[PDB]
């Protein structure tokens, strides 16, 4: 009901955006702030969301990625619970978007981007060049 052909008529500001594990790496690599970078790209308030699978995925990374773990635990970033055994974040992220059509997916993996692309009405955010880019979001 939220989808008009390929146009999602439910996703409206402020946006709820799921943070993928690799998104944080390139956000750090490009010196782009998570909260403001999304604000600049979309010109709207963004509510970043980190699920348990990505959060567990981050902790397994090791001491090298301590900064990303610290940023992931910033109080502004809300947490999303998981009711599934598997810890694979890509499978978790694909699952949630299918259930409810309100989430932006912020990621940089080519494989996960293709799977989300096949799902209709899912805006897909990525970090490239110097700042964030949003692909399938007409209100921009």
């Amino acid at each position: 009901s939220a989808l008009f052909f390929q146009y999602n008529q439910a996703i409206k500001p402020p946006y709820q955006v799921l943070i993928d594990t690799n998104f944080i790496n390139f956000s750090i690599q490009k010196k782009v702030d998570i909260v403001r970078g999304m604000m600049d790209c979309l010109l709207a308030k963004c509510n970043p969301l980190i699920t348990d699978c990505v959060m567990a995925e981050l902790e397994k990374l090791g001491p090298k990625y301590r900064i990303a773990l610290k940023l992931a635990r910033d109080p502004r970033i809300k947490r999303l619970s998981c009711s599934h055994k598997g810890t694979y974040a890509d499978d978790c992220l694909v699952h949630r978007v299918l259930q409810h059509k309100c989430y932006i997916v912020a990621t940089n993996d080519a494989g996960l981007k293709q799977r989300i692309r096949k799902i209709p009405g899912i805006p897909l955010m990525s970090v490239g060049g110097h700042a964030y880019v949003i692909e399938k979001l007409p209100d921009v």
Binding site: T21, N25, K60, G62, Y65, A89, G111
Partner: protein, 113 residues
Amino acid sequence: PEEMRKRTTEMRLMRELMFREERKARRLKKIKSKTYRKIKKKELMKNRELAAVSSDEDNEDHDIARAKERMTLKHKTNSKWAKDMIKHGMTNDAETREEMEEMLRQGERLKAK
């Protein structure tokens, strides 16, 4: 005593031994031909595979390895070397294409679940 003489001989053999590996190790060090090093590497991977010297990776070990690969994406064509070869028509050649594909299949392995 004469046992001291036995000690010197045992040391002498050990010293003569260490030199032999040093001479052989020095000579193999200088040879850095791709074909020669490629043949040695292939034979080594067979021996380790055949003798199973390497321990089996636990599911948790594979997950950690997969996590780092997703975190970094180090084995795609966006790397400096891969991008340099691709953009300048050096990958049309067979040999440098094999190295690129070797890199890509290795990345795919770590992506497997």
